[PDB]
Structures are given as C-alpha cells and as structure tokens.
Amino acid sequence: KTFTEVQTERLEQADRSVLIKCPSKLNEKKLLQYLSSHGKIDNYFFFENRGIHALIEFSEKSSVASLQAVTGIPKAAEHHVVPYKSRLFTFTLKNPGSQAAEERPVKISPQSHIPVNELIPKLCHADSISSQMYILLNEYQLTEENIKLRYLACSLVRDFARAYFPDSTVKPFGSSVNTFGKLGCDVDMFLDFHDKKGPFEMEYQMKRLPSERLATQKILSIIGDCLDNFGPGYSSVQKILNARCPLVKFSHQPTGFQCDLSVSNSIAIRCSELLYIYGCLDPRVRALVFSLRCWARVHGLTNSVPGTWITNFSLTMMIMFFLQKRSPPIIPTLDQLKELADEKDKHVIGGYDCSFVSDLSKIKPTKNTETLDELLCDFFQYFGNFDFRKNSLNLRKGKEVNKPESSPLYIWNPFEQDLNISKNVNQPQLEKFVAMARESAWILQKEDKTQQMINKEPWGLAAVLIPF
C-alpha cells in the first residue's frame, strides 16, 4: 500500500460512485435492492447535510451508465435548468401512495468533529496524557466515509475538465491524503491536464495553449464558471487567479466541503507523500501533530487566512524535525529515505532530486519508546528554548544549521535548494509561539494531575488546550 497505489485505488473507486439525495421517508433495503439491479454495490453509507444523502459505490463503472440511462430531467422545470448531467441524483417515488414496507431509521456517518468545548470533558475523564492525545486523534481524524466523499468531490470536478482534456485528473493533496487531515478541513485539489503507417502524416487540428501560467488561469477560469452555473451544488465560487499559484475556491453543498482547486505542482505532491510516510510509520507521529495543531489554533498561533501566522504545514514540519532529533529518532531523515530509494523511486523536479522510498517495509522500525507524555512536554521544552535567531530546521539532515538568510523563523524546504517554507513569519508571531510553548511546558511540568482530577479541573493536554 504505497501512497500512489492508494491514490489510484481511491480514485478508481470514486470513478464508479454516485451521490443520491434520499427522500425524507427512506427504506434502506428497497433503495439498495433497486440500485443493485444496475450492478453490484461494494460500499455505501448515508450522511446528514440539509437532509439525508447516500454515497453508493458500484463494482463496475458500467453501473453508473446503466443508472444514468434510466434517469430523467426534472419534468416541472425541463426548460428552466442547465441540462448538465453528472452523478448527483434525487430519488422520489413513482406512486407516493404505494409505500409498502416498514420504515427503519438510517445510520448517519458523521462528517464533522465534536467542538472543542465538548472535547475538554472527554479529555479530563481520561487516565493519562497518552490517552488524551488518542481520544483527540480519534475524535478529529478523517473517517473512511469522509475520505470516500473527498475523493468523490475530486471525481466530480474531474468530469468538467475532461470535456476538452480527456486525460485530465483531479487529485487531492494536503490534509485530505497525508494522514494528518481532520474532519471539516478543506479539500485541496490539483488539476493535472498535461498527462500502422501510410503515405501521409495525419494529425488532429487542435488549438494551441498559451504559456503555463496563462493556460492555468484560463482553464481554471472556465472550470470555475462551469461549477458556478452548471453546478448544481457549487457555490461561493471565488476566482483567485492572480495569486502566486492560481486558485479557485468554492463550496460544494451535497458533500458540504470547502474546496480549493489549482494546477498540479509536483513538489506539493511529494510533500504530501512524505508526510504520509511519517504518518504511517508510527501512531505517535499523528497523535502528536493533531494535538499540537489544536493547541496552536486554541492560542491563536495559527489562523485560517494567510499572513504572518505560523501555518499548520510549517508547524507540522517543526514536529517532524523534533521527532527526527530524538534518541533514538522516531522517524528517519529525508536523506535516509533518499538513500533507501531505488531507480523506481527516482523523481527529479526542477533540477533538484526529490527521490525517496515509497515502500514502508524497507524502513527499519524505530527503537524509540518514549511515551506521548514525555514527547508533548519535550516538544514545548525543545522549541521553547530553541535559538531561532541563530538556527534553522533542516529536515534533510535532521540537524540544526546556520540560516541561509536573515528571517525570524527559517525552515528549509526539503525539495527546493534555498527556500524557507515559513518565510511569512515575523518576529512578533514567533515570539508569541515561543512564549506559549514555554508556558505550556511550565504548566505540564509543574501540575498536580491527581489533585486536578479530584477537583474536577483541567489537566494534562486539556490544561494546555484552554486560553491562558
């Protein structure tokens, strides 16, 4: 199960999946027994989002065609609609009178996490700090159902682009696939659209595309407008084509996701695969990232809108660096992963060698056994006393090194020669992070966990996940 194998398997599954707006009065078996007539169904689930929807995953892609064959355009408004046919259906009854089977309630797969205030109680009633972080992890991480929904969303966007770029794919990256995603996070999408004889050389006549950026802007502008007007479920479609990386933001109502669509950047795909590996190598890695993300949000260190704030990605890279520096390391360095690679795993982008192992079995398991109790406090202790003015984080080496340039917080981009991934960060925001980390370390170091439990007060992870 390499990252790339998973992507391909997840996309092929989304390829043969549909969404169905269910009627208020729903008989599960009737619906499935009926749908089974178009072909076998591998998976399905239901979820709540302005009424009940169902994701159905067929075994054959031919089943989707078969279902579409018997699907019609709304009769009452056959002239007041844009007749774009997708895989978003609505299932009403021929004879509403002839409902003829018992009505069971249906199971709702949740697509959002419980809010922070509900979580704090669950954390206090835990036993140790280690358990607290696993509760939080369990409460926040992506479920199987949610993952399928994210891949489906990509597949629906792909179908628009394939109109004129048949070979195109739309693939998710970032949180949605790097194992560090939490429920409610955006779906980041990459559009990837570049993928006998005779006495004549016969060629199709085809319109030539502009220069990369200009092509990107036009392709995304048109896809943006299609989502807007061919819909049906897309709203709040914001074009941000003048950004460094041209972008389209939108909301997808059937699934409920906030989505960001841009043209493929092969570097960002490697970062996502890298984090996947680190995520898959040890469960403490994930448990630690989820807790420290939440911590950063709680104290206002991270924001949703860009600026001088530390970004979740940068913060995630610090956590990886920190884990590279343990005795013994919990995860390997990127150079260690490069040297475990072969010719099959060779990727070279923009000159620089972005190669590393894809098979996890070839990585030797860590000997480290530090508990999350120690690791959380040490994270705060470590970066609370890290000399940021003099040192930078190199994830290739796994070492503190001299800064290539005067910048408050320098984190070496592992896939681009001299690039600081946290270049946005100013001195004030860095100092506020350091102060928060120091306070967090102090609280954990000098608290009575038993006496706080007895008093029904916050303790451990819960004590650091509330304002100071």
Added chain:
Amino acid sequence: KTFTEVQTERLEQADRSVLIKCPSKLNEKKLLQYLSSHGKIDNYFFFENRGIHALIEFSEKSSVASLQAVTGIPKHHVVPYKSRLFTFTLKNPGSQAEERPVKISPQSHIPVNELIPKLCHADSISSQMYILLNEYQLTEENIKLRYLACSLVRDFARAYFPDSTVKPFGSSVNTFGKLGCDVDMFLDFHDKKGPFEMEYQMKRLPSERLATQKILSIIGDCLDNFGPGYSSVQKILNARCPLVKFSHQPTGFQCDLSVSNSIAIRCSELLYIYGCLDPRVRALVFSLRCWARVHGLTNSVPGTWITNFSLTMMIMFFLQKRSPPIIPTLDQLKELADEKDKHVIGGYDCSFVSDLSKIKPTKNTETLDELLCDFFQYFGNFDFRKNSLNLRKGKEVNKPESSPLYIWNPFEQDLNISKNVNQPQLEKFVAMARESAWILQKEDKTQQMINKEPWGLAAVLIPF
C-alpha cells in the same frame, strides 16, 4: 421530401463527414485510395480557404472512428480535443512532385461588377433573373459544408451536454440562401421495474432566458479557448434572442449560435415551402435582395433599414395577391394541415402542411418580366400609412398601430416584423421602386443591347 426529412438526411451525412487540410503538393488519387482503406467514400470535394481543404463523406460512421484510430496529436502545447478536423502532411516532402491540379468548388459568388456583363448578354429579363439565381444560390457542396459546421459545434457542445443537437435555420436551409451568407445555428436539447422516479439534481434558474445566457456564455468561452478553428467569438447575450457570433476558419463561415426558438424554425420551414412551390419565387427574391443592397435599402448592420427578411415577406405577400395567386396564404396552408402537422407555440397556432404534394399547383403563368415590374409598380403605389401586410389573410388590412411600415408576424399575436423601419427609409424604398418601375416600363431593350448598355434587370442593379 419534407423540410424535416431533409434536415435529418443532411445531418446524418454530416455525422459521417470529415475535413482535411491538404498539403500544398496534392495527389488526389493517393489521398482517396488511402482514405478508401478506412471505408467507402460517397462524396467528396475540395475548396480554397487559406490553402486547400477537402470534405470527405464516408458511407459508414465507423469509417470516421477507423480514421481517428490512426490519427495522432501534433508533435504550452495544445488543447487535446479530438474532432474531425485533420491535417494530412507528407512524410517526406522532399521526394515528391503529385503536381496535378485539383478542382476547387467555389464557396462565394462572383461580385456584382462581374455579373452585370453576364446579365447584359442574356436574352430576356426572365433569363437574367435565372442567371443571377444560379450565380448566387447555395451549391450542393456549400450546403454540406454548412451542415458539417453544425455537426462539429454539436460535437463540441456534446462535451458537456451529451444529448445536444445543433441544427441550421434561416438562409442556410430556407432555400433563399446565397453564397457567403452566415450560418445560423440552433442548439437544442432532446435525448424499468423500479419503484423510484430518478432524476438529475440540477439548479432551477428562474427563466429559460437565464439558462440560455449561461449555457451560451460557457460554450462561447470554450470555443474561444479550446475550440479548434473558431475565432472572433462575440457574446451577444443581452439581445432579444441571446446569441454567440464566431468565425470558423476551416470552412470560412461566419456563424451565429443561439438556443432553439421554435417560432424561427417555423418561419424557416414556411419559406422553404414557398421556395419549393415555384422557381419564380426564388428567382424573384434573389433579384430583389440584390436590388435592395445595390441602392442601399438593406444594410448588414441593424437599424432603420429594411431587412432582407422583411423584404422577403413583402415579396411573399405580393405573390399571394396575384391573379391567380402564385403561392397560397398561411391560412390556406393551415387548413390543409392535419393533426400530425399541429404545432402550437406560446398559445398561438403555428400549424401548416409539411407535405408539398397536398398543395394544388398554381394556375398562374405570369413571366418574371411582368412580375418584376409589377412588384415595383405594386409597392411603389402601395399606401403604407393606411395599410399593413397580413400574410395569413393575404390581404391589405388596417394597421394595429402607428408604424411607418407594418408587416404582420404570421406566428405571433400583434407583432410587426418591420417595426424598426422609420419614415425616411420607407420613402427611399418607395422612390427606388418607382424609379425601377419607370426604367423597366419605358426602356428600349433592343436599342440598349445594340449600344452595349445596361438593360432590364441589369439597368435596375446599378446606382441611379
């Protein structure tokens, strides 16, 4: 055959047709013998438009697939939309010449100044009008090219809208088209045991109009940026009938794309019938169109000018009023209809016969000589301030409203098709018609021929 039967036959032929940009050095037999390997070829011809192109029409649609199978994408590259526009180059350009010249089917008419000589050398006026008709009317080749253009836009629209069809209307199919006229295209939308009624989830836009505007806006942009051969794409979505204008470079056609309007399809079929009923009808329209252009009565850009369509409707009215009529009234055609020909649109009954055989042939035998002069005589002395043209009744009637020139729209309750026309332009038309009548009535045709001067139709197709 009926107008609808023809459309279907013409579209099916376009369905299994391709365009090929030929190489400069062209061997006809090699190309066809090769292409024949993919299947039998019913028709083909060549034409000039920034180099030589060829329309090839296969007998089987499978031949197009077979040809596409052996076709490649050209070696910031290209939008990989595969259509039926090909480029055949030579593998080895050097070891060729191969050099035998090819026949070019013309896609534009000879200009007015070249035509005047041909008209003077004719015998009668009747022949003049048939020369002009022959020189200007659409050829078979051109028709096929127009239907092909629609078929490609259909293929382009079917990317997002699989069920779509695109069909030409107006000049291109009503029999009154002349070479070089635009291709008007209509985009149309036409295509168990289970207990559920299953329907697509789609946004309900308030009006047909808003849907139309959005569909055409997106298709317009696609043609602009992804469409092969399409350029000069103008969006005119705020017009009465939302519209996208564009130029198609392989064929050379100026095209106008809009959403199907069932009224405009009926007008096209109506004019088809009148065109098919008698050759004098066409001969008369083509000459009077050209006459109107020559004296600046019609313009390409809209305004207060009389439009070719309005002018065509006057000519139809005039022919309804002959003794005996050359063509029937629309009410006569309605009453020859049956349940099969029943069309009711927007409340109003737009029904009429589609089978031409059920119309009794005209007994009229007036020559074009008489008919041309009479047209000018009739409308030269028509009282436009008091009367209006009703093509349903075939009668002069009182005007529903104060408008210089009122021509009743035959398919819509109180609508004047020539409402744009002001008093000055109407008066200039009347004056020109009167002068034209005077010239034809009081000229010596023999003495003008002897003197090598303009006479008859030629005398009225030059400025006064």
